[PDB]
Amino acid sequence: SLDQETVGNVVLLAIVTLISVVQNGFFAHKVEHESRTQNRSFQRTGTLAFERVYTANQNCVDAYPTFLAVLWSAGLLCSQVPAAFAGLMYLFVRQKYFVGYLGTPGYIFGKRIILFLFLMSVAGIFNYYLIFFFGSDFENYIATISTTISPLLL
Amino acid sequence: SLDQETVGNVVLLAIVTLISVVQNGFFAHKVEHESRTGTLAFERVYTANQNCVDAYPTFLAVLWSAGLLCSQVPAAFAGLMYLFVRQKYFVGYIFGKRIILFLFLMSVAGIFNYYLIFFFGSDFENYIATISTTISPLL
Amino acid sequence: SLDQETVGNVVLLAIVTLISVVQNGFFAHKVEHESRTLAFERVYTANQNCVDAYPTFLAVLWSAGLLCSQVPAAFAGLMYLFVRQKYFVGYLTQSTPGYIFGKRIILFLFLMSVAGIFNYYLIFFFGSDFENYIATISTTISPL
Numbered sequence: 001s002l003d004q005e006t007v008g009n010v011v012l013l014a015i016v017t018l019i020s021v022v023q024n025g026f027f028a029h030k031v032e033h034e035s036r037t038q039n040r041s042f043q044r045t046g047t048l049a050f051e052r053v054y055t056a057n058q059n060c061v062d063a064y065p066t067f068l069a070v071l072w073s074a075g076l077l078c079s080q081v082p083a084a085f086a087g088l089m090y091l092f093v094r095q096k097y098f099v100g101y102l103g104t105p106g107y108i109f110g111k112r113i114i115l116f117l118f119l120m121s122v123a124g125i126f127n128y129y130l131i132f133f134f135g136s137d138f139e140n141y142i143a144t145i146s147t148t149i150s151p152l153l154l
Numbered sequence: 155s156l157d158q159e160t161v162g163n164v165v166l167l168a169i170v171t172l173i174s175v176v177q178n179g180f181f182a183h184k185v186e187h188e189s190r191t192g193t194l195a196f197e198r199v200y201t202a203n204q205n206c207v208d209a210y211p212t213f214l215a216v217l218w219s220a221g222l223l224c225s226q227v228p229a230a231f232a233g234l235m236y237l238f239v240r241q242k243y244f245v246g247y248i249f250g251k252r253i254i255l256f257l258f259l260m261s262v263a264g265i266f267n268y269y270l271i272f273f274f275g276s277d278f279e280n281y282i283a284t285i286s287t288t289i290s291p292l293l
Numbered sequence: 294s295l296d297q298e299t300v301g302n303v304v305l306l307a308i309v310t311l312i313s314v315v316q317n318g319f320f321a322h323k324v325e326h327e328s329r330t331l332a333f334e335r336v337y338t339a340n341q342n343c344v345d346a347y348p349t350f351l352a353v354l355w356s357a358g359l360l361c362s363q364v365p366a367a368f369a370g371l372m373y374l375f376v377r378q379k380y381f382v383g384y385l386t387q388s389t390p391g392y393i394f395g396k397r398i399i400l401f402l403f404l405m406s407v408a409g410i411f412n413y414y415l416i417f418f419f420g421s422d423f424e425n426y427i428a429t430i431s432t433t434i435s436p437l
């Protein structure tokens with residue numbers, strides 16, 4: 001439905017987003033598998049093995065929207081390629097963090113990657129305003145010249 | 155990488171989202187600090203964070219729907235109010251229903267606006283096509 | 294703020310998202326009413342399980358809609374919500390559903406996105422193939 005130009009600005013971000021979706025499903029798969037090691041309803045408490053996978057998942061899930069926000073913020077406002085690479089790095093950290101709970105690491109992981117993607121977005125927004133104000137200064141500059149050189153055209 | 159014109163339609167929204175990211179970092183940090191030192195104080199901070207995390211993707215959804223389909227300024231302003239109400243809740247240990255509703259209504263209003271402009275464009279096109287055919291033999 | 298043409302490519306995705314927001318509010322309301330117990334644990338777990346999966350759903354819904362085709366994506370998203378309703382009420386006897394629901398819908402929206410990306414690269418390479426083809430003739434048929 002969308003044009004070829006704007007999809008080229010998101011394609012790398014979309015690929016890394018799709019990889020994270022596969023990863024999320026893998027995490028969910030691990031939880032469900034560990035849930036059926038117990039034998040009728042789904043509970044959020046259980047054996048030590050289940051509680052470690054469930055909590056690990058819970059941490060990964062709690063940080064997903066934030067990661068998704070900064071990834072796309074960095075990719076669209078600043079630059080796509082670096083943001084997508086840092087996005088991939090976050091996924092590799094998640095993978096090692098999630099398996100790291102399988103005997104424990106802390107509640108938060110990949111703080112610096114979130115920070116880096118956040119910084120890019122700040123730089124991108126500042127880069128947006130710099131180009132906007134330069135555009136309005138160029139517009140005012142041409143408008144001032146036009147009124148000044150106006151009678152000289154007649 | 156995107157053009158100047160589209161980025162100007164999402165910039166106010168993106169700032170609010172980034173501030174919410176810092177606030178999410180703050181909430182997660184406050185939980186992390188209490189996790190290192192089960193506890194009666196830990197359960198209050200964990201639940202508060204969990205209550206914010208559970209509502210966050212819904213908020214992010216209505217903020218961006220209202221901003222893109224309706225008007226950016228009121229949506230971003232309401233989004234900033236949500237992060238203020240969110241902040242006060244984390245001190246006292248569902249919040250901001252009325253804000254979520256306001257953004258939801260903005261989106262629906264923006265959607266209704268889209269269709270009005272679409273059908274008007276359809277009406278205008280059909281009207282010009284109707285005159286064009288009946289007038290064609292005259293030239 | 295966005296132009297009519299681009300908003301036209303996201304309307305159905307927006308509507309679905311908005312219905313899902315209503316459903317999230319319903320689930321959250323069902324939790325708050327129960328919080329004034331086993332009845333509370335089940336509603337909380339059902340909502341939590343739904344919430345956990347929601348951003349993954351929202352990601353593939355829009356990816357599918359934007360990259361592949363809006364109508365099939367929006368309808369599949371709508372199907373996801375019906376399944377999500379049966380799943381939530383299924384927690385509300387000693388037996389409940391598992392942790393995962395609507396995974397085949399997620400898979401379908403995923404595969405749409407992949408297909409939409411492969412569609413992008415096909416037109417792009419064809420666009421460079423055309424560009425390179427024109428440049429070859431423009432050099433050959435030139436000194437005339």
Ligand SMILES: CC(C)c1ccc2c(c1)c(SC(C)(C)C)c(CC(C)(C)C(=O)O)n2Cc1ccc(Cl)cc1
Nearest residue numbers: 021022024025026028029346393394396399400403
């Ligand atoms: C509710 C959601 C979070 C969710 C949960 C589980 C999911 C999916 C989506 C998907 S769809 C996706 C692969 C993510 C595009 C699948 C994979 C399929 C082939 C459909 C399957 O095994 O049933 N699983 C199980 C699975 C995922 C990843 C690994 Cl590594 C192995 C098995």
Ligand SMILES: CC(C)c1ccc2c(c1)c(SC(C)(C)C)c(CC(C)(C)C(=O)O)n2Cc1ccc(Cl)cc1
Nearest residue numbers: 063066108111114115118175176178179180182183
């Ligand atoms: C899981 C995720 C959502 C997350 C969690 C914690 C995070 C970050 C990201 C970030 S990066 C961000 C500030 C969100 C752009 C930081 C801050 C940094 C500078 C990296 C640090 O101190 O380690 N913290 C700790 C922190 C944040 C905010 C306050 Cl008020 C105090 C401490």
Ligand SMILES: CC(C)c1ccc2c(c1)c(SC(C)(C)C)c(CC(C)(C)C(=O)O)n2Cc1ccc(Cl)cc1
Nearest residue numbers: 209212248251254255258314315317318319321322
């Ligand atoms: C945390 C977040 C996801 C959330 C949670 C609860 C929410 C809302 C938003 C909204 S806003 C929305 C309905 C989504 C437009 C409402 C409805 C209102 C009218 C504001 C109310 O009763 O307070 N509730 C309660 C409610 C929602 C849906 C049903 Cl079916 C019945 C009651």
